[PDB]
Amino acid sequence: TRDQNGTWEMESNENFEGYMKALDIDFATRKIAVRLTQTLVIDQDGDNFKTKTTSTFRNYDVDFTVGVEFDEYTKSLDNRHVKALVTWEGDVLVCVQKGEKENRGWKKWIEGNKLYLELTCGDQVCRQVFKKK
Numbered sequence: 001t002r003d004q005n006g007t008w009e010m011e012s013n014e015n016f017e018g019y020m021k022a023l024d025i026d027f028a029t030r031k032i033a034v035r036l037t038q039t040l041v042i043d044q045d046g047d048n049f050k051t052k053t054t055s056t057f058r059n060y061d062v063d064f065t066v067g068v069e070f071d072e073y074t075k076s077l078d079n080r081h082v083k084a085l086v087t088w089e090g091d092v093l094v095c096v097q098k099g100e101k102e103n104r105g106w107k108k109w110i111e112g113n114k115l116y117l118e119l120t121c122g123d124q125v126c127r128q129v130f131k132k133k
């Protein structure tokens with residue numbers, strides 16, 4: 001399925017620290033963030049996505065249209081400009097953020113009743129799993 005609609009709660013988060021270091025997020029932000037349960041809420045209508053990731057701490061809103069290149073300024077992440085593009089490879093949703101960091105982006109797919117999110121930067125891969133609330 002390409003339907004990723006839902007309120008998804010984080011079950012697991014592997015190597016978030018390595019990914020965040022590859023991004024140059026400061027040590028203290030990394031230390032808080034690694035401990036936090038995330039909730040990802042995806043509103044998907046055709047090609048249009050509206051995403052909100054929420055935690056007790058900081059939140060990140062990301063909206064995009066599949067197949068439509070978009071500028072991003074990653075404020076209160078690593079504060080960089082990237083050229084982002086989200087497309088489908090079969091039922092994997094693939095984001096590539098072109099810019100200063102090598103191999104930036106994330107692969108979003110679907111397996112059984114879970115959402116899998118694989119965040120990449122440089123040589124680092126962070127693997128997250130979410131279940132519907």
Ligand SMILES: *C/C=C(C)/C=C/C=C(C)/C=C/C1=C(C)CCCC1(C)C
Binds near residue numbers: 060
């Ligand atoms: C498809 C959903 C995506 C790509 C969600 C991405 C969320 C982030 C890149 C946010 C990461 C965060 C940190 C690295 C530090 C704490 C703040 C967060 C949780 C927004």
